[PDB]
């Protein structure tokens, strides 16, 4: 009972093909794209009724979608453009026949595609982490202990940050900067920091054999690609930092 | 053509108390549907409550209640008994029933739900690389959630939002914010000198 959508994300190039893949399987018959751009609401794409195409608001012809199956609607990409930078949301709804009932059709949604057109893919690079160790102070003062963790320097800005403790990744006393934060701010291509908060008792900071990672996983260029530098070509990958409890 | 205009860009509430959302809409067709989404930090979007322009039965769905005033053209969301997971992007939205029901989504609310904080104890600590000792970051925790962390007016000293943290281990909640830059003239002391500060906040 949910719309399912691949890939979660996707950094292309304007000369790159791609296609993104919305699947159901409630038995709806109406289909929908929306694009939502950085801090806009969502804006209507394509409408599909009984795999047929009804709507298609001005949507230029580089996007290409189409409607295999009652359960699948693809859409197609080539030649895109960097304004074409967005979250590509997938929707579905019930559609009952002519004369039959009228519901609320609600539209349930997708995940959505997080999608990075870049005009150069030299833009690309992939977070730097850190890991920064409980202050003396705050320990003798609260009896807790707070580590911060810290990625820097990434671009595109989706990252994904966990904590794990002794090998086994954890959640509670966990914070993650909602969204991320532009390093440059008055740059079109910012590179981006987020920043996380793991916070422990001071007993359990000060045993020496626990173990702290802090883990970004960073979406980026896949194996297609082609890189063009003596820097390292920055594939879809994990960078980490670590740290060992200490006496202190 | 329809309208939906959410005045409201961001809003606040005190865990377990509630909420109003605004939202007033226009449209030209006379049966319509009005709804509800809220999209958090994942990126979904997940459906809340629906009204129909024909109901005249105010619309409720768990902890939330929709204040639909057609003569004001006014459907208001409230939301009851607010959690710390309700914190996400509300949306308002629209649509007509007549045809392929194309939803259209206002601007959209940011709500931040927050803790109601035991015991105060404002504090801006600083925090050392565990690889190279000279770069650090600075951390102000443990103040009371009316505090407000506000951006730096210079650009290149990085200063975080507002973070809720639970230790549910310990039944604790805090408040905290980072900040952290290159510049040689940077230290905890001046880090967050254009926020207001309570004035017995710790400095180690
Ligand atoms: C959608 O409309 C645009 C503009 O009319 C047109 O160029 C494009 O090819 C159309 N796309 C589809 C899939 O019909
Ligand atoms: C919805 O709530 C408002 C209060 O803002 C009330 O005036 C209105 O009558 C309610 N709607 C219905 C259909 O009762």
């Known amino acids: 009972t949910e719309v399912t959508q691949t890939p979660k994300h996707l950094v292309m190039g304007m000369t790159n093909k791609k296609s993104l893949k919305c699947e159901q399987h409630?038995?709806?018959?109406?289909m929908y794209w929306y694009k939502q751009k950085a801090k806009k609401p969502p804006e209507l794409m394509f409408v599909?009724?009984?795999?047929?195409?009804?709507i298609n608001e001005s949507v230029p012809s580089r996007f290409s979608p189409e409607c295999p199956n009652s359960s699948l609607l693809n859409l197609h990409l080539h030649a895109l453009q960097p304004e074409d930078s967005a979250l590509y949301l997938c929707?579905?709804?019930?559609?009952?026949?002519?004369?039959?009932?009228?519901?609320?059709?609600?539209?349930?949604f997708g995940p959505g595609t997080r999608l990075t057109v870049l005009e150069d893919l030299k833009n690309v690079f992939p977070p730097e982490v850190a890991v920064f160790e409980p202050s003396k102070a705050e320990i003798s003062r609260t009896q807790k202990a707070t580590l911060v963790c810290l990625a820097t320097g990434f671009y595109p800005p989706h990252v994904e940050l966990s904590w794990w403790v002794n090998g086994k990744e954890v959640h509670d006393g966990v914070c993650t900067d909602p969204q991320p934060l532009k390093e440059q701010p008055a740059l079109n291509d910012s590179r981006y920091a987020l920043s996380s908060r793991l916070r422990v008792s001071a007993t359990f900071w000060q045993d020496p054999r626990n173990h702290f990672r802090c883990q970004v996983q960073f979406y980026g260029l896949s194996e297609n690609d082609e890189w063009t530098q003596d820097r390292a070509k920055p594939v879809t990958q994990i960078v980490s930092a670590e740290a060992w409890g200490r006496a202190d | 053509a329809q309208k939906i205009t959410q005045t409201q860009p961001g809003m606040f509430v005190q865990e377990k108390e509630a909420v109003t959302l605004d939202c007033t809409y226009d449209?030209?067709?006379?049966?319509?549907?009005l709804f509800w989404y809220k999209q958090p930090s994942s990126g979904e979007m997940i459906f809340l409550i629906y009204?129909?322009?024909?109901?005249?039965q105010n619309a409720t769905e768990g902890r939330y209640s929709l204040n639909f005033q057609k003569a004001r053209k006014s459907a208001n969301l409230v939301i009851s008994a607010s959690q710390l997971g309700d914190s996400a992007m509300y949306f308002c939205?629209?649509?007509?029933?007549?045809?392929?029901?194309?939803?259209?989504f206002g601007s959209g609310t940011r709500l931040q739900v927050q803790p109601n904080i035991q015991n105060p104890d404002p504090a801006v600590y600083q925090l050392r690389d565990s690889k190279s000792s000279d770069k650090f970051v600075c951390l102000f925790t443990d103040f009371d959630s009316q505090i407000n962390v506000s951006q730096s007016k210079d650009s290149d000293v990085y200063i975080t939002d507002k973070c809720v943290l639970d230790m549910r281990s310990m039944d604790f909640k805090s408040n905290s914010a980072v900040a952290w830059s290159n510049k040689s003239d940077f230290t905890c002391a001046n880090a967050f000198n254009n926020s207001i500060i309570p004035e017995d906040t710790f400095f180690p």
């Open positions: 929707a579905s709804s019930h559609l009952g026949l002519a004369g039959g009932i009228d519901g609320t059709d609600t539209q349930y």
């Open positions: 409630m038995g709806h018959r109406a």
């Open positions: 599909y009724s009984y795999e047929k195409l009804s």
């Open positions: 449209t030209s067709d006379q049966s319509y549907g």
């Open positions: 009204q129909g322009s024909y109901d005249e």
């Open positions: 939205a629209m649509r007509r029933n007549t045809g392929r029901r194309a939803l259209t």
